[PDB]
Design a protein around this motif. Sequence first.
Motif, short mmCIF file in Angstrom:
data_model
loop_
_atom_site.label_atom_id
_atom_site.label_comp_id
_atom_site.label_asym_id
_atom_site.label_seq_id
_atom_site.Cartn_x
_atom_site.Cartn_y
_atom_site.Cartn_z
N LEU A 28 -37.43 99.59 31.34
CA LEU A 28 -37.09 98.35 30.67
C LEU A 28 -36.46 97.33 31.60
O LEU A 28 -36.65 96.14 31.41
CB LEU A 28 -36.15 98.62 29.50
CG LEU A 28 -36.78 99.35 28.33
CD1 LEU A 28 -35.65 99.91 27.42
CD2 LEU A 28 -37.67 98.40 27.54
N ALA A 29 -35.66 97.80 32.57
CA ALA A 29 -34.88 96.93 33.48
C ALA A 29 -35.68 96.47 34.70
O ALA A 29 -35.35 95.47 35.33
CB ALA A 29 -33.61 97.64 33.91
N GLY A 30 -36.77 97.14 34.97
CA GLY A 30 -37.53 96.90 36.20
C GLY A 30 -38.32 95.58 36.14
O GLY A 30 -38.63 95.06 35.07
N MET A 31 -38.69 95.09 37.31
CA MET A 31 -39.59 93.98 37.44
C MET A 31 -40.97 94.49 37.86
O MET A 31 -41.08 95.48 38.59
CB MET A 31 -39.08 92.99 38.49
CG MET A 31 -37.68 92.45 38.25
SD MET A 31 -37.60 91.43 36.75
CE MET A 31 -35.94 90.78 36.92
N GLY A 32 -42.00 93.79 37.41
CA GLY A 32 -43.35 93.99 37.88
C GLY A 32 -44.33 94.02 36.71
O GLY A 32 -44.02 93.55 35.60
N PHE A 33 -45.53 94.49 36.99
CA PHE A 33 -46.65 94.43 36.06
C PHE A 33 -46.84 95.79 35.40
O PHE A 33 -47.44 96.69 35.99
CB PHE A 33 -47.92 94.00 36.79
CG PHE A 33 -49.17 94.08 35.97
CD1 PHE A 33 -49.15 93.79 34.62
CD2 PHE A 33 -50.38 94.42 36.57
CE1 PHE A 33 -50.33 93.76 33.88
CE2 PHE A 33 -51.56 94.41 35.82
CZ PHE A 33 -51.52 94.12 34.47
N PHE A 34 -46.21 95.97 34.24
CA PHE A 34 -46.22 97.26 33.52
C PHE A 34 -47.11 97.23 32.30
O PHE A 34 -47.53 98.27 31.82
CB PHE A 34 -44.83 97.64 33.06
CG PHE A 34 -43.90 98.02 34.17
CD1 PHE A 34 -43.90 99.31 34.67
CD2 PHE A 34 -43.07 97.07 34.78
CE1 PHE A 34 -43.03 99.68 35.69
CE2 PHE A 34 -42.20 97.44 35.79
CZ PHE A 34 -42.15 98.74 36.22
N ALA A 35 -47.36 96.03 31.78
CA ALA A 35 -48.03 95.85 30.47
C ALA A 35 -49.42 96.49 30.38
O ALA A 35 -50.15 96.63 31.37
CB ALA A 35 -48.10 94.37 30.11
#
Length: 450
Positions: A294-301
């Motif tokens: 939840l806290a991370g940055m980047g392309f997870f979607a």
Amino acid sequence: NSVLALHPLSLGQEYAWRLQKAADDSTIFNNTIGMFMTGSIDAKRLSKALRAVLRRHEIFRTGFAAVGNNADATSLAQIVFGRTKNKVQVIQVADRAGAEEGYWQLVQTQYDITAGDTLRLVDFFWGKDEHLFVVAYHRFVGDGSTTENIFVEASQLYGGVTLDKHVPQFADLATRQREALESGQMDADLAYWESMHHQPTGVVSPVLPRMLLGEDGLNSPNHARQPNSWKQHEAIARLDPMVAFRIRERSRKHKATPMQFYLAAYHVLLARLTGSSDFSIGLADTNRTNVDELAGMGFFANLLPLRFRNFVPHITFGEHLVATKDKVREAMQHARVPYGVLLERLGFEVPGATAETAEPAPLFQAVFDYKQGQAESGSIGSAKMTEVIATRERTPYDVVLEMSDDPTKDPLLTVKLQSSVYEVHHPRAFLESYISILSMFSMNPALKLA
């Protein structure tokens, strides 16, 4: 400057790279989110905040480089630099029209991803403490949750908060996901989706019919899909607050969520307009499943390809809502599979955004994307947000319904239709029909589907 480490693309990055390669012009996969805000923001403090966000997260100091000399493009890899190559800008404009002009220039920006040029962070400012704060991102480095996270981190830093030293870095998380696939731990999830989408040995996966909206209409256009590099027509509306209220009430009483009501109603409208009794809807999902994700940055979607198959028009909406609730809950048990790895397993080709083809998307041709955040959680300094302008990447899907359901506003609905199939007035016609159907079912869930 220094290279800290090299990593493979994440699974999601890798499929996105194949889409980008197949497109004539990958500028169409830019993402650009503008937030209008009114109130004092100190430029130096904001720019220092945003620079610290860039430094914190590896994925914002990542480039993407060819592996080998003549793959040609068979591998890209992430290069994590010691220092960012992205920049923060605070730009004076004449007036709002100047700000909007800047925004639409950022929509056309050329990301040099090889060099780690992957983000734009721009505070356009004019008048008496007016702003348009824009977060723009290459596909590989962001997504809707990442945009939320940037605002929230930047706000806190601006306000003098000390963020946690621990930062969940993108490559670490992406590697864990790849290892789960390689080690067989996604195999049960893969079998779930594969079995859902299996066909008799003859039979091609059905594709969503053209919806009858229509340009009027009587007597079908039935014309060829016209190659348009996945250009989309769109329309946007706010939902009446009493309709939203009824939806919350009737959802609760059926032990369902408002999201499931909106999805069920979308499915019913698609079935009505197409006449299909077996089609699939890609349900957007953040694929963030724990504190670090939840806290991370980047392309997870991700997208989950729900198949709505054995369709029965005489059941009530209430019954369909409950069944749709169960379908979503079951899907969410198997949500960790990046859809591109399913597509590959099922034998699909990568679709191409070009001027010479306009093939339907593989497997599903409709998408539903619902989010519930509070925009205001990322308010900055003394500026209050008033309005968002969002231009997400093009996608191949015939029909896309994206919704925001910010609990302190009214729901915002965006419908996008492929210009290859649909006319400029059709998104509004769909959106009107959808609002009508939400109003009718939320007034009376005992009504039949069709």
